[model samples]
Target: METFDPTELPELLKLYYRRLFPYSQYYRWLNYGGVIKNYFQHREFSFTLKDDIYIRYQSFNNQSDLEKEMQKMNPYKIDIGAVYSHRPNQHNTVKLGAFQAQEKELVFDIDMTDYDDVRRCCSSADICPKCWTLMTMAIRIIDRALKEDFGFKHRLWVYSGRRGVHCWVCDESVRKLSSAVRSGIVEYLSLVKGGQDVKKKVHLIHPFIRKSINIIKKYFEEYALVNQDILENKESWDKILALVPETIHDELQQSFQKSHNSLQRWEHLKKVALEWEIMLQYCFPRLDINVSKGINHLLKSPFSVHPKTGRISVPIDLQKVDQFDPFTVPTISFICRELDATRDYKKTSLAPYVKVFEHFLENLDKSRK
Candidate 1:
């Protein structure tokens, strides 16, 4: 109902942990059907308390213990890390060399800041409807590859609260993959590369790229042409034209000058051989590769409250991703207020998202049976 109040965050967070946090599902997802001994105990759970106080390597005996500690700590943020050889909390007692990161879900972090070079609407932590489509594209491309290309069955897509999305592939086999293997998967999925200097970042020769192009095509016109208006001005159009053939530069520029709007300009560009490069540069998935490459990288937990934005990082239902809106995501204050009024989580806006999470868990649980 109301926006987040920083002064009241502590009390809101306390109420959130006590009543709203989905402890059972959180434990069940990490525990992986309890198939391995000490699986839950060895996993790392890091907490960021008020005033930038970060506590790492926090582990618990079970779900109830974790729930108790989380309620007491009322952490500003929670990060889930790799399962270690020994309990993360007791790593100090083990031999120095014996303590090491063992396994973790193959994760990917795609932030809006990474797309700042292409997205004109917002930069850094800011996001709008136009730029949010990038996340939808990422989820579509990567989720498809994870299932069809690699045979992964359990993939969890979560919004990063502020300006990004995170994908955690929880397939039992995917979790235990070596760092090198993880890197390989990231490489296959990556398209737009290099820094600002690289005028053309995408090459569309592979089958994967071809398939991704089909997915990106659905949103390119609505997102880039209308909402983003990427080619509305000379500076932006020049950047996009640079990706096309050098010989057609003069012709494309003249045609673009004649066109009245982005849609008209896009029609002119489409007639020439400029589709792949322009589309790929503007809409391809931009990944933060390092996040996926490291086994021990602590990713913000799914239900963790984002301190700065006050938004909960909730699950994305794949079926409804096309209609997903970041601004509509329930804020801590809003949901807490809902609880105070309704006294039931299912009665709040967050219920459907929890249903999405529970549905994913149900599918994951099915594999064990």
Candidate 2:
């Protein structure tokens, strides 16, 4: 894939859209195609282009119309058993012809609720593009591994639609596999076990692991267990805050308090903290202190305390972080912050809820096949 340059965006996007359009059923009245065309035209579309494209198209208040339109785009089916959004007021739409149908339409639906926190938190730090790029890269790596190592062939790409991307593996090789094998494939992609030798397998995978670990550490150290008292007591927080340089302190503080709950608050802190770390790493090369390590060490040490509510905070340590891995910890944290902050699952297993997408895909594969 070539590096995305703004000058070449129009032609590049035109090529992508034209290639993808054949597989999609265009709805002229709804202006779905226009939206996509306009997106590339108006925005500075600067990201690496990949072979696989995930398209999300939608119909306007007419299920029958959508079904008919989908049928018209023969040889390509709405990922069967896939769920589409039905939001009342939002631009909750999908792309029609962007993906090549492999087995069936493994459709899933998400709204602002699912990714609002991810957008808000990441965007506040001007890292949404980075996050999206990372997600796309991560999905592609998993897709390649599944095909290369396990011989499960499929195209993996991100949709330029509202919610998330679809990993459409169109190779007919997978259709012959049993439901059990398909389940195994999905599991293998999503789960990263300890001692998996992630570094040796793929260079892109390490950044994901590192980012995930750092994010988890931030959750445990700053958000999940942080309170006013603990923040005030922690010398690390003091040192970190002092380093903010006053010019950006008020803006930082406002962003910090805007988080409605402890979790959001934690994300706010983590974003600013990461910025400081990045600046220091670049400006002061002698200080080998990176954000991830500094944050992890601070949480692990005994001196770290909550800045405001002077309470002894319990850190989500490496062991705990290990147990949750990629899904449960992040998803659960997201659920708590975004979905239902009051919901509790202290005794019950959080794994089921965390692996909701995996289960959805499993069921989707079974029913579609």
Candidate 3:
């Protein structure tokens, strides 16, 4: 909420260090407004700093070097603060932190990119209440599936101090995975198409195609100003069809050709839209429901008329918060610090770390369902 200047950075860094010491260390601060596009851009970097100066690192790189570097720094006596790592690329590192004379430690990893972006969508500050509610519902869906279907424990959440939040799943079972496996696990948890055999089991094609056709039909009905007879008659249909855009017309014609007859095609179009609406409701209930004129009017008021004005109006307070610069906050610093700590460095052997990272990826994918 407050804009922090570079001059105040040192004090903030000190506070961060105190909170997250030897296990973590400060990197450097990043300016998001001027330097980046989206929150996921931070993924390219290995470490980042918090606004207050606390540091977080990625543990997917050379660990022997990290261990050697650790030897140089005394974790117990170090002036640094608290430390945390996301899905470290090493199994022994956790053990190392636990037994080695290191500063107080906390180790957890998550797909911060997904967490932050989803959070941004849900928080009314960045997105409309409709969108926020939809995204929150999606999150709840994913969370419930993960916890119920898979036996995972320890829910970790972080206020990104901007438009979003980060969720961490720190169950010990995740530790058994290598980095690749961990990545797979994350992919599984995200459940975006093309992960594994899950798609076949879900039977997503019919639903997706049906939904697509419905969207096209709805658009046509809304934009098509001609009479129903004109749309039905061959000559009149040709005339009416000419008014449609080439891209849309082609798609509509193709969809129609796939049906048994003209009547069937027309019915299919309507059916497609209905199916799509259903899927959209399932995926993003909050946003999709309010956007439907019938539902909105029925729920809000008995005689409410759908506004013809295409312009969308949002609360002034909501826009102001959405427009706030995320970079000015301490969270950006933490992200940057974590990225820097994980930057690539050459070492004699890296197969172990690579394997660890692989495991993490695999598990990450598995958890997405």
Candidate 4:
């Protein structure tokens, strides 16, 4: 894929901000039904312009004002920061730096690069269907934890438009969690520990580790062993070997060296140790704990365009989680093509992605009321 041309941004924003961006769904998310007082007004949004100029603490009176400014500035990127004590745009009117950061959705960022050490298919911001299963497994595991373990009601899962996913844990209690509480949540989800010196990063304990292990077990054989062909590759086999101790490691590696394929090797290894935990280390959700733990940290807003790929950061439908394909994600280029072909300004073009976004809002409504 080609890098989105910087020169075209001036013109592209004209079309994008005017037509393609999902203003209605986005407005609904941030405004929160106007149920909370000044909810939209107090939220902080930042914009990054050409040449990396960043404007912070931006707030708007309502959705229309926000839309107008976004179109006017035509930012290179947008980041949704924290809700503050006062409206962000008027921060200068208040005491300097007194506009303390307040609530935000307890957020989590899961980047594919974090899995580079384990996945054999892609590396460094690249992804494929084989490795995409890692993300699929992650969303399944984490979403369940937030719902069942913590009883969170409003979890918003979004594709990062490139190599990862971001979850906004939108429960009211989660939003109010203190630093220690946020840190605690991150710890509960964390399984891997130790540094470069520790060969086995995943050490499984009973009860605390069981739920995550169950989720990993559901997908491991088909997703990892078969599709990834992990055991067939010498390098990939080394990864599996590294998870076990030296005494068992050498024996397991030797046995696997003779096995005909991945399934055979996986079955051989399962007899020795917890196979699910080993695969979980390779496939489980790798959360950017800092994103979840800090209210001030800004994540790219949903519906924002990825500067490189020109794909919108859209919400994920967890019900159809298995069928989700990053490759089929709606692209701005495609939306523009549809617009040009139909010349339909009413958004009645072939851009079905708009319907997908609207459906997300429709679900959000069921929750809101």
TM-score of each: 0.96, 0.28, 0.33, 0.91
Positional deviation of 184 in candidate 3, in angstroms? 4.2
Instruction: Report the lDDT tens digits of candidate 2 across residue range 1-369.
Output: 112233443342333222322122222212222422322111110111233232332323343444344333321112221112222112233244432212221111112222222222343323233233333333334444644565543332323122233343423344334445554544444322112222111112344334434433333333223422223323423333554545665665565455454445445666654442322211111111121111001111111111121111111221122232221222112222332433443222333422332333343344335
Task: Candidate 3: list runs displaced more than 4 Å.
Answer: 4-6, 19-131, 190-369
lDDT of each: 0.87, 0.30, 0.30, 0.78
Backbone clashes, each candidate: 0, 28, 79, 0
How many clashes would you count in candidate 3? 79
Residue lDDT tens for model 3, 1-369: 123244444443343233322221112111112222321111112222232232233232332443344333312111111112323233245655542111111122122233221222233334333333333333344344445555554333222332333333434454233444544434444323322222111122444344333433443332222212223434433443443435555655665556444455455545533333323322321112111111001111100111221011111111133332323322323323443475422221222223333343344445443
Angstrom error at residue 270, model 4:
1.5
As a TM-score, model 2 comes out at: 0.28
- Sliding window of 10 residues with minimal summed lDDT for model 2: 295-304
RMSD of each: 1.5, 23.1, 19.5, 2.4
TM-score: the better of candidates 1 and 3: 1
The full ranking of all candidates by lDDT, starting with the best, is 1, 4, 3, 2
- Checking candidate 4 for backbone clashes, the offending pairs are none
Displacement of the residue 226 alpha carbon in candidate 3, Å: 28
